[PDB]
Design a protein around this ligand. Structure first.
Ligand code: 06Q
Ligand code: CA
Ligand code: CA
Length: 327
């Protein structure tokens, strides 16, 4: 069903390379300075100091495409300002059907390997199949850009490369809107909410949207350019895309408290207030709810009360696949 981006035929290219005993080299997006960028990542930029291009099979003994599932902990931002895109990838992982379309799971660095991978993207109103070779930007032996918490897992590095490819360069991804990423992974359409002027049933809207596999993100407005990427006292990040990854009501101090879970695509730096990983609120919830919801791990993911979320965050976006035809 997906059309072939630039006519490149993943399976025909793979089979040819396997037959000729060679590794795929992508003519359409070569491992050259212009694929990194033009200005901040351009040929004469100090920020490209030391960057080389290496396949995962040139880096480690047993590179893997997917380890323990393709999940949101596999999305840890690198040195590129594509937080909006990475938040969208992390949200995508919660919708198992769309995840398996965007990320074809039958790819490997072992059996069948020819140095070529492919992904599906929604582009200009249609699904397209995008190939990449697996040369990736490396500095000091590590991925420069997105990487997994598992150092030998490469699906998200390669998906980010495919998204750079359709944009012409990695630097073209620097600075953006989460809604673009949401839509390019789902074919859905984004609704935007100003949390100061939110409907009274917003929490129920969020619950139903997560349940149906929509993709959700949130952010804190900046007051000025100097506010960009500022870290607040309670370790939220301003001007920065977060994934909304969960929502649950718990019984707490005789009331029902609505909680919301979100993930910083840095994979680190989390809220320190109520419902944070080591907060004392967890001592007064049910032991089963505490076990189900709370994970003490610096992974970028944490809970907040909905009250605090509405106090600290400024906007929420919800990308629904079929917003006029729900269940
Ligand atoms: C992320 O916070 C990010 O990638 N942080 C890690 C990082 C920062 C700086 C350099 C490397 C890695 C983005 C940081 C921006 C990116 C550009 C450089 N300096 C920055 O502070 N933040 C964004 O991309 C915001 C994300 C956002 C999403 C939703 C929302 F409601 C508000 C913010 N977007 C921009 O900064 C931005 C968006 C956009 C659209 C069109 C034109 C220009 C433009 O800039
Ligand atoms: Ca994984
Ligand atoms: Ca955490």
């Amino acid at each position: 069903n997906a059309i072939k981006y630039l006519g490149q035929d993943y399976e025909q290219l793979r089979v040819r390379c396997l037959q000729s005993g060679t590794l795929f080299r992508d003519e359409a997006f070569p491992p050259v300075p212009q694929s990194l960028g033009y200005k901040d990542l351009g040929p004469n930029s100090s920020k490209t100091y030391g960057i080389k291009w290496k396949r995962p099979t040139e880096l480690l003994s047993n590179p893997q495409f997917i380890v323990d599932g393709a999940t949101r902990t596999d999305i840890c931002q690198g040195a590129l300002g594509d937080c909006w895109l990475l938040a969208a990838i992390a949200s995508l992982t919660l919708n198992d059907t769309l995840l398996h379309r965007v990320v074809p799971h039958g790819q490997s660095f072992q059996n069948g390997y020819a140095g070529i991978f492919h992904f599906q993207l929604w582009q200009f109103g249609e699904w397209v199949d995008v190939v990449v070779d697996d040369l990736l930007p490396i500095k000091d032996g590590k991925l420069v850009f997105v990487h997994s918490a598992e150092g030998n897992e490469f699906w998200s590095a390669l998906l980010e490369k495919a998204y750079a490819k359709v944009n012409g360069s990695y630097e073209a991804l620097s600075g953006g809107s989460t809604s673009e990423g949401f839509e390019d992974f789902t074919g859905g359409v984004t609704e935007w909410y100003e949390l100061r002027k939110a409907p009274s049933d917003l929490y129920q809207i969020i619950l139903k949207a997560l349940e149906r596999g929509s993709l959700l993100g949130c952010s804190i407005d900046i007051s000025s350019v100097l506010d960009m990427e500022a870290i607040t006292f309670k370790k939220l990040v301003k001007g920065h895309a977060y994934s909304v990854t969960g929502a649950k009501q718990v019984n707490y101090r005789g009331q029902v408290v609505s909680l919301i879970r979100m993930r910083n695509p840095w994979g680190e730096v989390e809220w320190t207030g109520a419902w944070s990983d080591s907060s004392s609120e967890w001592n007064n919830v049910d032991p089963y709810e505490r076990d189900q919801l709370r994970v003490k791990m610096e992974d970028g993911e944490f809970w907040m009360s909905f009250r605090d979320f509405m106090r600290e965050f400024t906007r929420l976006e919800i990308c629904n696949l079929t917003p006029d035809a729900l269940k």
